[PDB]
Design a protein around this ligand. Structure first.
Ligand code: SF4
Lengths: 47, 170
């Protein structure tokens, strides 16, 4: 009010932010998965 | 002076002077109620709904609302949509060049207490921090029915303005 303008003061929250990604499995539960690589462009096995 | 005196929320006209002042107050508040000129501030998902009030389903011209998008002719301002850090001095400046019997109404949930962007970095956590807002219109698509209801709430407040009765200092 007293500067009759807006001022930029450092952060204060009413409510602290709460993420919930702390509950998380370390390994990604998706599997390895198959490929779709073309039979031309993957390496031929020896013999 | 009397040690007991009725509150201005509780007082009734008893002097003929008070009947005159109350009817004159009613005429002033009544012209303030009917003619009703906000300013188009709307900027975001909360601005199409302001246009939905101008749409031919929920008309505002039948209420006397019309958007003189020029803040010197405006009675009130409808803060609508989100409010960013980058804009907010312009919001203050648009509030500055308004005439004195003014109000401002916070359409939209971002416009009060941040809303959906309460934890962003470049956002004002509701337009409380800029202008003194008298009616909030909640709703994240704040309903045309709700926006009009906010206007009727504000008009009830306008009926209780008592600009004339305070010359007697009640
Ligand atoms: S009230 Fe809803 S639509 Fe409007 S700015 Fe906030 S989040 Fe967006």
């Amino acid at each position: 009010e007293e500067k009759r303008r807006v001022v930029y003061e450092p952060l204060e929250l009413t409510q602290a932010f709460r993420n919930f990604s702390a509950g998380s499995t370390a390994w990604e539960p998706v599997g390895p998965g198959r490929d779709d690589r073309p039979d031309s462009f993957k390496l031929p096995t020896p013999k | 002076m009397p040690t007991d005196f009725p509150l201005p929320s509780q007082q009734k006209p008893n002097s003929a002077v008070d009947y005159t002042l109350t009817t004159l107050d009613a005429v002033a508040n009544w012209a303030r109620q009917g003619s009703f000129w906000p300013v188009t501030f709307g900027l975001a998902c909360c601005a199409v709904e302001m246009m939905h009030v101008s749409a031919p389903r929920y008309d505002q011209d039948r209420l006397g609302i019309i958007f003189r998008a020029s803040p010197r002719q405006s009675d009130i301002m409808i803060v609508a949509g989100t409010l960013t850090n980058k804009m907010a001095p312009v919001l203050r400046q648009v509030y500055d060049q308004m005439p004195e019997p003014r109000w401002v109404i916070s359409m939209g949930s971002c416009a009060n207490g941040g809303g959906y962007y309460h934890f962003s970095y470049s956002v004002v956590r509701g337009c409380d921090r800029i202008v003194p807002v008298d009616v909030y219109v909640p709703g994240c698509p704040p309903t045309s029915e709700a926006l009009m209801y906010g206007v009727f709430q504000l008009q009830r407040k306008m009926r209780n303005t008592k600009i004339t009765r305070m010359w007697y200092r009640k």
